[PDB]
Curated annotation (Swiss-Prot), chain A:
Subunit of the fusion protein that is processed upon entry into the host cell. Mediates fusion of the virion and cellular membranes by functioning as a class I viral fusion protein. Contains a viral fusion peptide that is unmasked after S2 cleavage. This cleavage can occur at the cell membrane by host TMPRSS2 or during endocytosis by host CSTL. In either case, this triggers an extensive and irreversible conformational change that leads to fusion of the viral envelope with the cellular cytoplasmic membrane, releasing viral genomic RNA into the host cell cytoplasm. Changing T5N: In strain: Lambda/C.37. Changing N2K: In strain: Omicron/BA.1. This is Spike protein S2'. It comes from the Viruses.
Length: 49, 49
């Protein structure tokens, strides 16, 4: 009421959740390769090995 | 209450008042305010805003 305003964040909560889901899927299916280049698939037991 | 004429917010600003002519209660809300922002590309490119 006295001239103090809060501004909305640029990225909504849903977009943040989508980014986290993308990172999580990438780290599940590709190990660490997608971070350092193109995503190469790898079975999860072999990534754990 | 019968004795109470004014009402204040948590942050000590008036949010309610009692009419003297007629014993009624009114919620006082400040008139709308906002920060005008202008979206424009470079003036060299165009003059639309």
């Amino acid at each position: 009421f006295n001239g103090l305003t809060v501004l909305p964040p640029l990225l909504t909560d849903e977009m943040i959740a989508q980014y986290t889901s993308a990172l999580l899927a990438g780290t599940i299916t590709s190990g660490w390769t997608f971070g350092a280049g193109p995503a190469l698939q790898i079975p999860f037991p072999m990534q754990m090995a | 209450l019968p004795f109470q004429q004014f009402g204040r917010d948590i942050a000590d600003t008036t949010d309610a008042v009692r009419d003297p002519q007629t014993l009624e209660i009114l919620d006082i809300t400040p008139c709308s305010f906002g920060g005008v922002s202008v979206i424009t590309p470079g003036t060299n490119t165009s003059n639309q805003v």
